[PDB]
Amino acid sequence: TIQPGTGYNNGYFYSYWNDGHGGVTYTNGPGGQFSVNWSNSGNFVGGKGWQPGTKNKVINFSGSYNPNGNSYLSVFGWSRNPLIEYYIVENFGTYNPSTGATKLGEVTSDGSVYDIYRTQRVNQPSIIGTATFYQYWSVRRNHRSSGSVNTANHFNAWAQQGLTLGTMDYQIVAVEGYFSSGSASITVS
Ligand SMILES: O[C@@H]1[C@@H](O)[C@H](O[C@@H]2CO[C@@H](O[C@@H]3CO[C@@H](O)[C@H](O)[C@H]3O)[C@H](O)[C@H]2O)OC[C@H]1O
């Protein structure tokens, strides 16, 4: 594993965050590759990409994703002013993150329809400290662990529906888990 934090590796930004619970290891590999191994973890997020992201980046990902429990695989990042945590969810484990959320539209992109949602986090950790903030979601109907994501299609559809983003902070392909186990090996470009 590596130490939780951020930085650059082989030309790609990375970010590895966890809640301190234990049970998760994160490793940086050659080029845009990263691996995650977890067993009875807490909450964590790790992956490679860019800092800052952009609003029209085409992001490619390829590899294996084997969750056992609650986990997501997504194009993931933040904006500032307004503070937003966003997800383009390509696959997940036992929990669809939009469960119970209100559907705010549809967008077709990169071989699937996606459903659009907004949720809210109350007094949770963020890139600026503990805060209350909205989250934006595009959830892919046809799950996959390789593909291409045209981020502009998502950001434009969100804006059309009233979900506007601020200035872009980091933007990565992320594996997230919440009290689960699994393994993953993903290459970004
Ligand atoms: O020490 C600071 C870190 O906490 C910070 O990193 C961010 C911490 O919050 C993470 O957010 C969670 C992502 O997963 C969701 O399910 C949770 O609800 C969020 O709270 C965020 O992804 C990390 O980047 O960075 C700055 C450090 O000073």
Question: Annotated active-site positions, please?
Answer: 85, 176
Tokens 């559809």 belong to 157
Question: Are 158 and 116 spatial neighbours (Cβ–Cβ below 8 Å)?
Answer: yes
Enclosing domain of residue 157: 1-189
User: How was this one solved?
Assistant: X-ray
The CATH number of whichever domain residue 8 belongs to comes to: 2.60.120.180
- From the CB of residue 140, how many other CB atoms can be counted at a distance below 10 Å? 22
CA of 111 to the centre of ligand 1 (A): 31
CA of 138 to the centre of ligand 1 (A): 20
- Which segments within the chain are labelled E, that is strand? 5-9, 12-18, 24-28, 33-38, 43-50, 58-68, 71-80, 84-92, 103-109, 112-124, 131-140, 147-150, 167-178, 181-188
- How many CB atoms within 10 Å of residue 10? 12
C-alpha of residue 127 to centroid of ligand 1, in Å? 6
CB of 95 shorter than 6 A to ligand 1: no
User: Can you read off the two tokens belonging to residue 71?
Assistant: 């986990």
What is the number of the ligand 1 atom nearest to the C-alpha of 76?
22
The number of domains in the chain is 1
Indicate whether residue 120 lines ligand 1 (CB < 6 A).
no
Pocket flag, ligand 1, residue 60 (CB < 6 Å):
no
Of the candidates 145, 116, 120, the one whose C-alpha atom is nearest the C-alpha of residue 133 is 120
Return the residue whose CA atom lies nearest to atom 20 of ligand 1: 125
Resolution of the determined structure in angstroms stands at 1.3
Asked if residue 124 has its Cβ within 6 Å of ligand 1, the reply is: yes
